[PDB]
Isopentenyl-diphosphate Delta-isomerase 2
Amino acid sequence: LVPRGSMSDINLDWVDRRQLQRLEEMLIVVDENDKVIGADTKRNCHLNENIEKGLLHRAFSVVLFNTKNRILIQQRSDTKVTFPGYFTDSCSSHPLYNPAELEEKDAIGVRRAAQRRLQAELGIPGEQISPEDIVFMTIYHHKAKSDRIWGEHEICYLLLVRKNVTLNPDPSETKSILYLSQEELWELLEREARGEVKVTPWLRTIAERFLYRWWPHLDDVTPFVELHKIHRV
Ligand SMILES: [Ca+2]
Ligand SMILES: [Mn+2]
């Protein structure tokens, strides 16, 4: 049984109606080797009480760069269930349990989900970024807590896009956007480490493990693609 100190455990008063409705999306539950074992809701997949029992889902993170090699850093809206108000990567979300997004060859299901969410969150039309533009790079397995009740536990596909795009972001999803140079991203993380700014834990991981390596090479990142690999971070 899950102990409940009080009914404050069930509080989602900061979350808007749209984000509450999205808690019912059916996600792809996987094992530690990224094999599909079933479906479960966004709500269930992001409860620490379930994550601690091993519940794990497939997800993605996108790093989007313009042609001046600035990265798009989202600030999550204050209405997100997890990490509200935090600065983070360009787009994170999950493929859904449906035929189109379950498709595994060349990670097309995940890349379709990424297009879908770049459109939904940032208002980037499909004409500007299609799945062909979204490059599969590698996979990382991570766990984080947003608060005592909610958190993350993902086999997370790291995807890269380098394109100039237009934005019409959904304020339900996104509070603000920064386009940072590599130097400015390093500075953001230095400030995070002092306590100045809230940043999702996986952004530091992606930056220090991958982005600094890749940045001088954004014109062709194909050497850095890792198949048959899951980083445990
Ligand atoms: Ca998201
Ligand atoms: Mn997740």
